[PDB]
Amino acid sequence: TGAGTPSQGKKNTTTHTKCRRCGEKSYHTKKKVCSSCGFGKSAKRRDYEWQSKAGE
Amino acid sequence: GISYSVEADPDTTAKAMLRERQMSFKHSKAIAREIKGKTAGEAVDYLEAVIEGDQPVPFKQHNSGVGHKSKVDGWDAGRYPEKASKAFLDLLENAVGNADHQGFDGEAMTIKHVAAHKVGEQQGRKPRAMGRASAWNSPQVDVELILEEP
Amino acid sequence: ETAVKSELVNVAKKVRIDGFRKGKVPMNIVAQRYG
Amino acid sequence: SWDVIKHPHVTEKAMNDMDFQNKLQFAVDDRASKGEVADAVEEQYDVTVEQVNTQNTMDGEKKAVVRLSEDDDAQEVASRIGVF
Amino acid sequence: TVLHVQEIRDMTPAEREAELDDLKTELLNARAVQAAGGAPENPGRIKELRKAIARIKTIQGEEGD
Amino acid sequence: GKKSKATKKRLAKLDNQNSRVPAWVMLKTDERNHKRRHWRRNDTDE
RNA sequence: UAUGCCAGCUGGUGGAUUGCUCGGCUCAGGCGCUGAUGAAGGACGUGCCAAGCUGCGAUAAGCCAUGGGGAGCCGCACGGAGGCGAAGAACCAUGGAUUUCCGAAUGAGAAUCUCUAACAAUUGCUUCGCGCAAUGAGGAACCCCGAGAACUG
RNA sequence: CGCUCUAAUUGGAUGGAAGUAGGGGUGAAAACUCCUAUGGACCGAUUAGUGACGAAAAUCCUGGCCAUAGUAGCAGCGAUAGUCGGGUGAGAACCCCGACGGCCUAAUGGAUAAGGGUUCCUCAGCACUGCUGAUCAGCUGAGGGUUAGCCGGUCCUAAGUCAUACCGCAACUCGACUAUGACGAAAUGGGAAACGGGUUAAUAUUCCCGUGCCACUAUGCAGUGAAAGUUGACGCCCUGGGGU
RNA sequence: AGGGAAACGUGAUUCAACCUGGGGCCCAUGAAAAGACGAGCAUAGUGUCCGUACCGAGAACCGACACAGGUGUCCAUGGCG
Ligand SMILES: [Cl-]
Ligand SMILES: [Cl-]
Ligand SMILES: [Cl-]
Ligand SMILES: [Mg+2]
Ligand SMILES: [Mg+2]
Ligand SMILES: [Mg+2]
Ligand SMILES: [Mg+2]
Ligand SMILES: [Mg+2]
Ligand SMILES: [Mg+2]
Ligand SMILES: [Mg+2]
Ligand SMILES: [Mg+2]
Ligand SMILES: [Mg+2]
Ligand SMILES: [Mg+2]
Ligand SMILES: [Mg+2]
Ligand SMILES: [Mg+2]
Ligand SMILES: [Mg+2]
Ligand SMILES: [Mg+2]
Ligand SMILES: [Mg+2]
Ligand SMILES: [Mg+2]
Ligand code: NA
Ligand code: NA
Ligand code: NA
Ligand code: NA
Ligand code: NA
Ligand code: NA
Ligand code: NA
Ligand code: NA
Ligand code: NA
Ligand code: NA
Ligand code: NA
Ligand code: NA
Ligand code: NA
């Protein structure tokens, strides 16, 4: 059963959603953790120095 | 859009145009080339006939794969562009209308000048295999007509 | 019957007002008047 | 502080619910419970509200179908409430 | 407009609340008229009503009710 | 799929934002609603 | 002389060029903390008609006071209707009012809703009663203490 | 030689600059200059400076455009389907009515889960979308529609998850255990209660008519028993009986 | 009561559902908790909140497309054969 098109069918699961904390559709209602802000995981705003070039 | 690429004397001339029409630009040339020098009337009766399928239009340029026609004089390939022909009848009905309203005898006037110009395409996309899409546009045509007292 | 509203009555049949389907309008909702 | 009754819902079905069933349709603030819906409607218009049905519209507002008592008349009440 | 600040301060905590529930209602009766596709409107006031009520509430604050 | 009050409220706004730029505005600005979303061609969040 | 080749002329297509700049880029001086008296951020609202933005917050493109200001005005937005202003508005400065929900998020739960009185948790003081307080998060980089690569040479 | 901008000196321009198109002259040449049309507002020369400074080439980047071509596809699938009259309409091979002729029968029928998100109904349209056309539409524009004590959610607990504590960790938004709390099932787990009829353009065990049921609370009478036990509460195969 | 233009039947066989039993198997032994019952009756009051439109597919979901693909449950008792 091809991994392409065919395997696209079962894809009717809901996971990522409008995070209550940020407003991005990154709240993984399964893990209840915001891949974008860290809500549910960290009380601090998820952020990284690599979300931007080294000297910027 | 275009503009009359030909100087016309208002005292003895009648103008008319078509704008951004969606028809085959390739048919338009043929028909034009074919109805030039004709009498507005002979011009109509001609198109009407074309539409009917009794009179064919000589496809001298864009003839690829076209089937030869017996009624074509001096040439071989030809078809019957109806849609285009209709659009052309309108162009004339206005051309002949404008004339009459100025006092001229429309029908009796000669087609001093007529020419189709591709004013652009109405872009469209066509899904293709392997998940790619290829252009799929519609031609947008303009065309001029200039009648003159015989 | 109405010489003051026959021109108001014979409107309800061709008013198409917001919220109401053609002709099914309460006349006093068609209480909007001009002229 | 927010107010309950936002305004009268006037559409065909609305009227029919008034004419034939003696109910009045309003648009209320969604945090309003059916009960709160009642009391408010009774206080603003001087009527006895028997039943209140509520629906959270696809409009973001709440609709309320409030039936009065056979003693009161929506058609009449509706006259005093703008509408007519 | 029709209702000036001065006039609001020349009211009693009662008069304000009374004048308040009065505007609140002229407001409601406008939103009603408007909700019914009514044209006997005058947008210049349904706006003022809000403002008016604003002020009044504003005074109630300052005066300590 | 079962939606929630909060959700419904949003689908609602969404639907609201999906209306055209009113004619009167066109004249008031002497001269497009970029946020136009079709129910099939587009995908809303959540 | 069809089909047709080369150059041009009239029109088109196209958006180069020139001119322009309500934006950028870099430098320099000044200045520099915010948050449980609940921020920063987000959600949803808020206009006569109002979809985007901005502003605002159910007192919703706004309320009050003092100073400035001036015949004009009702944001971007040059519509239609109506309205506000010498009871001196618009507009500007400062001070104040209001300031929905989610949000450190702190009564408890939850994709911005909901369930039956709240400093949740951790502390200090302690009338040992959360009574009086603290921490919690944000911020362009800068700063301090720790953990600490490899490509490459 | 030519390009940008700065400086000094010095000039041109709405009695029309730059740029552009065609045309004349000079220089070996990079290139300079003039004329005509256009344009409709800036433009130079010398010297000294400046530099994101001169391309035909990189399967170069971005944009535009030609031939290809009125060509390939709109046939191929055990679902080959239409036809004749007629309605509307500016326009009808494919929008609607009638007949005749077919297609689908675990599905091309009925009810749903997820998911979608208003795609539903009505009116008005056809510049867009619709493998042709469209007077049609899941298209566009304007209005409207989802009404529940007894259908679900809500509650419960399942694998398992989180939060707080405790401990670890340089440290945490990290980490196993142990406690306490909470979370975890909308077809398809367990689960207090509703049936039939009627009604709309669209809702319906939700609204209306009739009839019935459940829980809590209060008042009144009965009861003093009420906590043990029973139920919830369950594998696979074969099979008898009852029965709509 | 309702529904039907009207008649508004009676018996029968085979009988999904639903009820209730017997038997066999396992180096497989086939949840839990809330809740109900145990523990009556009359009258009255209360029953808030959230979902409730439509598709559910060779056009309304995933596959960039009104994509010959993919996608779960119930109707497995419509006639002949
Ligand atoms: Cl072409
Ligand atoms: Cl349900
Ligand atoms: Cl037996
Ligand atoms: Mg793979
Ligand atoms: Mg051929
Ligand atoms: Mg694909
Ligand atoms: Mg409800
Ligand atoms: Mg909380
Ligand atoms: Mg000099
Ligand atoms: Mg070929
Ligand atoms: Mg056949
Ligand atoms: Mg809509
Ligand atoms: Mg439809
Ligand atoms: Mg229609
Ligand atoms: Mg639970
Ligand atoms: Mg069940
Ligand atoms: Mg339906
Ligand atoms: Mg339904
Ligand atoms: Mg199809
Ligand atoms: Na040729
Ligand atoms: Na011949
Ligand atoms: Na011939
Ligand atoms: Na409204
Ligand atoms: Na979609
Ligand atoms: Na500063
Ligand atoms: Na707006
Ligand atoms: Na503020
Ligand atoms: Na505190
Ligand atoms: Na304490
Ligand atoms: Na360069
Ligand atoms: Na068709
Ligand atoms: Na059979």
Side-chain angles (χ1 to χ4, degrees):
Chain A
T1 311
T5 312
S7 295
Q8 290 314 76
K10 302 168 186 172
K11 293 195 177 179
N12 76 311
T13 297
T14 288
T15 51
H16 292 265
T17 63
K18 191 93 178 176
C19 173
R20 193 208 320 167
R21 186 209 256 196
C22 88
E24 289 296 299
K25 178 191 154 301
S26 309
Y27 193 51
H28 200 85
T29 202
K30 293 276 188 157
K31 313 158 192 304
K32 303 297 186 185
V33 157
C34 200
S35 68
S36 191
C37 79
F39 178 44
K41 190 205 187 191
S42 169
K44 302 173 171 69
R45 287 310 192 91
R46 164 181 185 280
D47 183 273
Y48 295 87
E49 292 282 2
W50 44 254
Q51 301 179 292
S52 66
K53 289 290 184 175
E56 196 169 56
Chain B
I2 63 175
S3 288
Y4 293 89
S5 63
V6 188
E7 305 191 62
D9 182 300
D11 284 297
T12 71
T13 260
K15 309 179 177 187
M17 279 193 282
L18 282 187
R19 299 297 199 163
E20 292 182 292
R21 274 314 197 72
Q22 288 178 53
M23 43 189 231
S24 160
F25 176 45
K26 305 200 181 190
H27 295 186
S28 310
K29 314 179 183 187
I31 306 183
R33 175 194 289 90
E34 191 47 46
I35 71 171
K36 183 180 174 187
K38 289 186 173 185
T39 268
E42 318 180 313
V44 190
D45 293 298
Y46 177 79
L47 306 185
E48 298 191 323
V50 169
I51 294 180
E52 195 60 56
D54 306 314
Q55 195 81 57
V57 176
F59 276 15
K60 313 195 66 180
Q61 177 152 174
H62 311 294
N63 49 358
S64 49
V66 181
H68 290 173
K69 299 293 171 293
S70 48
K71 292 183 175 177
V72 169
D73 198 64
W75 189 256
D76 41 35
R79 270 171 187 175
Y80 316 85
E82 60 133 59
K83 186 171 181 172
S85 297
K86 287 181 178 183
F88 270 90
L89 278 182
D90 291 0
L91 186 63
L92 289 150
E93 169 184 59
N94 171 76
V96 170
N98 300 172
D100 296 305
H101 191 47
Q102 291 172 60
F104 302 78
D105 174 29
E107 306 191 304
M109 273 176 276
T110 309
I111 292 183
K112 162 185 178 175
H113 175 270
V114 51
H117 310 56
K118 181 172 188 175
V119 180
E121 308 185 306
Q122 168 180 292
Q123 303 183 299
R125 219 63 179 170
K126 168 66 84 173
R128 299 288 230 125
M130 313 306 271
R132 152 209 180 191
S134 53
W136 192 268
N137 323 301
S138 314
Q140 303 187 299
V141 183
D142 271 20
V143 33
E144 41 191 347
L145 179 47
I146 301 175
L147 302 171
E148 176 178 50
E149 289 196 300
Chain C
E1 212 69 299
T2 353
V4 183
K5 291 187 293 293
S6 61
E7 43 265 304
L8 284 294
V9 181
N10 290 299
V11 175
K13 273 204 175 73
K14 316 289 184 174
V15 294
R16 77 278 183 78
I17 67 175
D18 299 298
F20 295 86
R21 183 175 34 177
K22 257 284 262 64
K24 325 304 184 186
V25 191
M27 190 177 100
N28 265 329
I29 274 301
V30 187
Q32 50 99 300
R33 161 181 272 188
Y34 267 76
Chain D
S1 185
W2 56 280
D3 308 306
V4 198
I5 296 173
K6 283 191 176 179
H7 68 70
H9 193 281
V10 61
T11 74
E12 207 192 323
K13 174 169 233 168
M15 297 312 251
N16 285 336
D17 259 42
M18 162 188 90
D19 286 296
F20 308 169
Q21 304 182 301
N22 199 57
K23 303 174 186 175
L24 294 169
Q25 279 167 37
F26 308 76
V28 307
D29 188 296
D30 44 298
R31 321 184 197 71
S33 68
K34 296 187 176 185
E36 299 186 305
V37 177
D39 298 310
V41 175
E42 292 190 300
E43 295 186 56
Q44 274 289 56
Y45 307 110
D46 194 309
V47 299
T48 306
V49 168
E50 292 304 307
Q51 189 174 299
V52 179
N53 294 270
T54 60
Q55 174 185 318
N56 258 292
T57 306
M58 273 294 293
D59 280 8
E61 304 184 70
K62 172 169 296 185
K63 189 168 72 182
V65 172
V66 188
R67 194 183 69 217
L68 300 177
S69 73
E70 286 173 46
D71 194 308
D72 310 286
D73 183 296
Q75 287 175 288
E76 304 201 302
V77 189
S79 75
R80 293 145 47 196
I81 328 168
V83 178
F84 281 115
Chain E
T1 167
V2 194
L3 171 51
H4 296 76
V5 183
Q6 290 188 301
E7 305 184 301
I8 296 184
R9 286 170 173 171
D10 290 314
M11 283 188 204
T12 192
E15 303 172 75
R16 292 165 189 162
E17 299 182 60
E19 182 55 41
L20 181 58
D21 284 298
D22 277 297
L23 291 177
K24 280 190 169 177
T25 294
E26 191 185 309
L27 191 66
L28 194 68
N29 296 316
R31 287 175 178 171
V33 176
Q34 187 188 61
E41 304 169 298
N42 285 299
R45 270 193 192 171
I46 182 166
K47 177 175 178 183
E48 286 309 309
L49 263 169
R50 303 189 81 192
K51 274 196 176 187
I53 307 175
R55 294 203 192 66
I56 287 185
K57 283 191 175 293
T58 301
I59 311 296
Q60 307 192 80
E62 319 183 310
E63 313 297 63
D65 291 42
Chain F
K2 305 292 162 292
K3 69 197 76 170
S4 56
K5 176 183 181 178
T7 292
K8 189 162 187 178
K9 266 188 63 185
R10 297 196 225 96
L11 279 177
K13 178 174 181 60
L14 274 176
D15 175 40
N16 200 185
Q17 300 187 313
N18 198 186
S19 70
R20 188 154 196 166
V21 181
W24 68 269
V25 174
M26 300 290 260
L27 305 170
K28 195 174 188 187
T29 68
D30 292 297
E31 299 176 57
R32 278 193 177 184
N33 182 308
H34 317 99
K35 299 210 170 186
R36 284 173 182 160
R37 172 185 62 69
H38 183 59
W39 67 260
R40 197 166 177 182
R41 283 302 188 78
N42 291 297
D43 177 295
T44 67
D45 292 5
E46 296 163 61

